[PDB]
Symmetry: D2
Subunit: 396 residues, 4 copies
């Protein structure tokens, strides 16, 4: 009587593949696209989750967003290999951008909000990055770089399901959203915390944030770029400029508070940015396109010509191609480059929840809510349908 | 014949006064209240100001705010000594929270906006702290701690006048406000940059700012406290709480975006702060009351009982009394105390200006605009009339 | 049969005491000195340690330092109450400054050095703050402020024993000391990591550290002050100045790299600090006396009169009395005050270990090594014998 | 009659050169190597310097080091153009790494040591970046990015001379070295403050410094790389590793505190770095080779494979070639890249001076001291003679 969206695939590695040190033959690899072949995504029966450890909770799922990584796990190259390049342990229940209600909690399952055992009925979201808590990075406070990481919806059953079990240490209360987001809207808001927290980690934690009055430039208007728009407007950016080919995304960015939006295929990016900032340029650039080798010369030209100094370029999207870095630009303009990944640690989750509670409405980016049954359809449709910004499962 | 509001007093020191290392007999002291007696303040004739160095500009003053410092220079204790404790060189033209248009400029009088000589007609405000730019603190980037400081409206003629001369290096363009603040409102906003920058230096630079989603508590709802409300809400504070006995001030705080206001004479500050923040407390406390010895226990008790950690207390008001500091509170809650002084350096002035341009309207705090002729009267009135938040000279 | 040094006391609270929210009647309090009476320390037989969770290890103790807190747990006021004011769960095996060798490890007991299960024979030291890993402060990377804290040698059986059981996540490898420190000296050095890490957390992590060339002033030459001398010299402090009335501690400070030592009882602290620093003062002051209310005026006078700015006062010692803080001093000299506690997180332990491995030898401070049997005697003797800087249990 | 080492060159631009917005035809350009041609360096007679501003001082030069910049200003490509690519106003007296004694000071010429007028006899060094103090970068505390810069020994007469004149605000006392550095050595140490401060800015200010116990890796063992070695050893680095093809420089690095040296042409840099750090790698990498495009893939490999995280790569050498940056490496290892230039601001000069006073002896890197007359010869010789690490004029 229980059902979830699951991905099955054939372990059939490419000839260059050698089993990685943390890979498990036939079951788990750190290099998905080298190994897993002919992915199939279907709704299927699953056994009931059960509390195995005293710190575990079982959440009844209300909403779950489809990530671009979900699309890439289910999509193939010409040879039938998945596009998704990273950690994958199939078969798995997909979905990691979620919220729901706690329906069961082991005796040691603590809610950080109360520092007491999780109570039935608590609305929660959870982290996708399942950090171990004991390794050297975790012990220094850097869980996004855990040496023993697992990933919800990648190799641990996720949340395109009726129920999902996770350790309490990954769950965060949505109680603050109550009476700000009525009914289902609370859970929609909750399901956007993970991708907003990716953006938050990138611009606030790794980026170093801004002083109010600073300008920022975001490249890429997907979910992460869009969350950056809202976050940095809320952080007090005087000008928030987003560069993005897609019109629906540029329009969304305006709803989220972008002061200017650029279509880089029809406008000169460099000139628009300099004009918009009166030659000052920006304190922070967020590279969220995934084509940094293509946008990098433009970013450098702004940094070079701008009168502002101390610019940070935060790289959050994944790409393979090399970046054409001109050392001199960063020397002469007192600028720097940081990489970002993940959404865990640093109190990022709770601050994003508080920020949502205090008015920051990300639910605007949800193009469509759908039933669990329609999720396989939309996962496939997102391979080509550029009009869809964010599709969210909603259990009604 | 030009006129300005000038203050005169007698050099007649208290018995404890010994001439300071940088004091000049009869003319200048760093210990104003120990020295200056029976102050008189009036509109009087002044000679034309003039370019005397190639770096100088002359500004036709459009607006100048009365600071509590001006009130304290003209108010005496029961023995006739001025209340203002710091650097004072009388007689002087008063006024240092001001804006106007440039009407003359030396050949080396550079506008930072263009890196070119100031244009006649350029709307500007200026810093009150006249840093030297060559001492060790200045050379390290800390001009609020200049070893050879002079102060506009304290020992150098100021801006309650028709015209004021200042070095171009102190002046900042208000061009960004054009077509956002129309007419006199541009100069009213310009005149609020200095006090707003004192707040900004205290909460962003010294206090270290906040991450969006943090809570903040401001104690004292004078101009500095009110600026801090607006600045920290603009920086994305989830809850901004202001504590101030005065109702007019609390209501203005709401208008500037404070989420909760506390009258500490009628309500329990500690319980209200804890109840408003759901037991989390705040990342930042601004002590802007000047009675730190009275509010310190309440601050400490919040920090102690609050579950939030890493709280910073920023001390911006000048008080003479010992603060009853409990070390253990700061050790156990991982908290710290920073002092703050002034408004110069760190690109505060230009950020405050861009922030106002982007929507942060501080002009809401202006209780009254008056003519130059009325300024002595209002400086007197402000000794007792606590309903007036900010009174501003407006040259029409 | 195994033996250990255990403290027994009577649950007999002062009239003012009310049971704390986390206290357990008859067993555990957060307020030791308000509750525990007539303490007695004895070597007694103990049950064999057991791996009960798969993450635990058992360590054969080689060395354990007597802390001042150990002395204070077994010392009483006139009415028989213990002097130690903090968390205490009696009876308990004392000892928390220790090293030894792994003799057993559970299946999931991971050594951070290798990211593999601990090997039998691995030399280790361990943290005393037993942080939970899951509360909000832990999840934000601040484990010294853990909401569910236990404490080794306070309410969890400690290391004045032949064997001690701890979770693997508190243990740190001493491999790097092999061939630098021969035989027992390796374990002696290991036993000093905890107090050295308290100093390290106080001056590097909380204090913010220094830039090479900065001056530092340390008040108090107990083991914490002595570690700070060593750390801050290794950190590139141009001048390290220690103030301590005990001659033996001043000579130890010189041995650890202090450039100047001050006997405050026979010398003028303020003038001596100002003379030695050529009027510059210091970037960092470490208050490690426990009498911050006696030394504060002198610290404030140096900060005030010094030409340097941006001084930090870090408070590490526990004191009860209020500090007479003059806000103005901190405002005018751009100075700050941070509290510090604990030694966990931030990678402090392993960096302290690497530092020792590269030449920083703290074993110079060990006055005497003694057998387990002699420990109760020395805990008593340390109440009055000030010649003993550090006394360490050595098992052979 | 006074003399100084001066460089004369011809204004004769490359065809692709257009006069820059701040250039002065025949006199000053921001692009030296696009304009100046057939440089000649000679000792010649100069007028006596004169206090022209109340804030100026006049310094009797005691020591001046030759910078790689002086070499590239007097070195040419095959078509006769200077190798130096930046701001140059010729003719000029060369030399900008100097110390000496104040012999005349204007009425407003304040010594930061005293906050009073400089007095005759004060040993000083001075900054080379003549920052304006008033532009927005200067106003914000960032004078290495001054919008109105002048440069001593580039377009303002420098210190390969018996005397040099500078604004008091660029000058820093060497009082603290008295008693520690005996005789001429005080002035040798002073002359090394500017290049040492370049390294300090790069590793402490821009690089963010380190926590004691951290490891560091320096690539390039020129004067900047070698100062970084001493600075970071003094900062408490548990392992200081320097990679450098030159044997003389590797040997100097060990004298300066390096725990390990690597010859990358005869050893595997990646494997050596991981071995010496027991797989943990480094907190900070200083790219001071000027060939970042050749060493970069090796840095990325150490960072990728090391178990340490939060690594910073600080790029201080000037190069032209693009860097093959792999973004994924910095994302997955939580690492970052910072650029650095200059030596001004942030209290770096006075800290470097205090550091030298407390025991950091940079004077070891001086290969040879020469008289003013031999400077032009050594400026030429340094084009080819790689065994000379640092050559210093001693008056
Ligand atoms: Cl992290
Ligand atoms: Cl400052
Ligand atoms: Cl902590
Ligand atoms: Cl700079």
């Amino acid at each position: 009587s229980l059902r979830a969206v699951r991905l099955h695939a054939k372990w059939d590695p490419r000839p260059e593949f050698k089993l990685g040190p943390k890979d498990i033959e036939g079951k788990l690899t750190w290099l998905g696209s080298k190994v897993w072949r002919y992915p199939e995504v279907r709704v299927e029966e699953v056994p009931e989750p059960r509390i195995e450890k005293p710190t575990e909770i079982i959440i009844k799922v209300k909403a779950c967003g489809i990530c671009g990584s979900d699309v890439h796990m289910a999509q193939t190259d010409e040879e039938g290999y998945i596009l998704y390049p990273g950690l994958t342990g199939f078969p798995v229940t997909l979905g990691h951008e979620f919220s729901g209600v706690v329906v069961e909690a082991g005796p040691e399952a603590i809610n950080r909000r109360t520092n007491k055992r999780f109570e039935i009925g608590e609305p929660v979201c959870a982290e996708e990055m399942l950090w171990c808590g004991h390794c050297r990075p975790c012990a220094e406070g850097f869980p996004n770089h855990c040496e023993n990481l697992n990933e919800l919806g990648f190799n641990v059953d996720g949340a395109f399901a009726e129920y999902v079990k996770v350790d309490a240490k990954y769950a965060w209360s949505l109680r603050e959203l109550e009476g700000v987001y009525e009914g289902d809207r609370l859970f929609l808001a909750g399901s956007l915390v993970e991708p907003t927290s990716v953006a938050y980690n990138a611009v606030i934690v790794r980026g170093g944030g801004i002083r109010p009055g600073d300008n920022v430039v975001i490249l890429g208007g997907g979910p992460i770029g869009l969350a950056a728009v809202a976050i940095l407007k809320h952080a007090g950016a005087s000008k928030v400029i987003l560069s993005e080919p897609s019109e629906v995304r540029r329009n969304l960015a305006k709803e989220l508070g972008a002061d200017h939006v650029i279509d880089p295929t029809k406008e000169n990016f460099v000139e628009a940015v300099l004009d918009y900032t009166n030659g000052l340029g920006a304190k922070l650039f967020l590279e969220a396109t995934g084509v940094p080798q293509l946008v990098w010369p433009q970013i450098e030209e702004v940094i070079w010509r701008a009168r502002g100094i101390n610019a940070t370029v935060a790289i959050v999207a994944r790409a393979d191609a090399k970046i054409p870095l001109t050392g001199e630009v960063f020397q002469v303009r007192r600028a720097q480059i940081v990489g970002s990944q993940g959404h865990s640690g640093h109190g990022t989750f709770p601050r994003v929840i508080s920020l949502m509670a205090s008015g920051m409405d990300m639910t605007k980016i949800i193009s469509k809510t759908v039933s669990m049954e329609e999720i396989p359809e939309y996962i496939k449709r997102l391979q080509t349908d550029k009009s869809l910004v964010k599709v969210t499962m909603l259990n009604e």
